[PDB]
Amino acid sequence: VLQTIRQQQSALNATWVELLQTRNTLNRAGIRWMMDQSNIGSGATVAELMQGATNTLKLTEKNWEQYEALPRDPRQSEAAFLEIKRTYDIYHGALAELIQLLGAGKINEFFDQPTQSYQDAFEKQYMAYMQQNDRLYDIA
Amino acid sequence: VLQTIRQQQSALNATWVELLQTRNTLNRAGIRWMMDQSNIGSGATVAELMQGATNTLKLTEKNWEQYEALPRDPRQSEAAFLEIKRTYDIYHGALAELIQLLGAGKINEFFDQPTQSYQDAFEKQYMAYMQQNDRLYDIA
Ligand SMILES: [Cl-]
Ligand SMILES: [Cl-]
Ligand SMILES: [Cl-]
Ligand SMILES: [Cl-]
Ligand SMILES: [K+]
Ligand code: NA
Ligand code: NA
Ligand code: NA
Ligand code: NA
Ligand code: NA
Ligand code: NA
Asked: How far apart are CA B71 and CA B5, in angstroms?
């Protein structure tokens, strides 16, 4: 009912969060990488931070696949779902690419990547779709 | 009453989400800082990143005061809210400290701060608060 959508919402939202956690951890690995170049390294290591971001990006893919396999109400928009998946797939792909640039030490390319646009296109769709699902609440 | 929950959950989630975008932005700024100091600055500027971070930390403050003023059902746990507040206030205050540290060139104190621990601690209370509200939705 209003619970099949509250449950589909929560799945999607754990994808959002894990993407945002992957992104931040990766940007931590960036600082440490830069410090190591200036031999002022300290705290968490590049290798450990990359490990957590490999972790949370895999968690991201698994949270996504669970949100897809959830059922959809017919009253929900199929173009919406497909636009959610288009932006996710760019965003996740972008974070998967950050993992490679850093391992290869491509700090500028790493940092010049417009992850922020990819994320914003995905956040745009997320916010729309939660409005369309909150409406389904208002009317049930 | 069921509507008053989703409203709470959405206000609190919006704070979470924004606490995470701020952390990522801050870490972006430290990479760029490090880069400026090594004369390989590219991408977005420290100044642009620090003003996004300043901006999103106020949105978090605001998102938070909106969640707080939403009426809390009597079946919801006053200790649970109090513990969210505790971990929220540590986490928020910590990202505020990161703004001051980076402004001051204090990159090691920036990178060393145990932000993860404050985030984890907030996320623990948030995950538990949701499962409770979700069991509570279930009942009704
Ligand atoms: Cl590069
Ligand atoms: Cl961008
Ligand atoms: Cl320092
Ligand atoms: Cl920590
Ligand atoms: K991890
Ligand atoms: Na943006
Ligand atoms: Na929300
Ligand atoms: Na600098
Ligand atoms: Na910029
Ligand atoms: Na603002
Ligand atoms: Na407090």
From this structure: 9
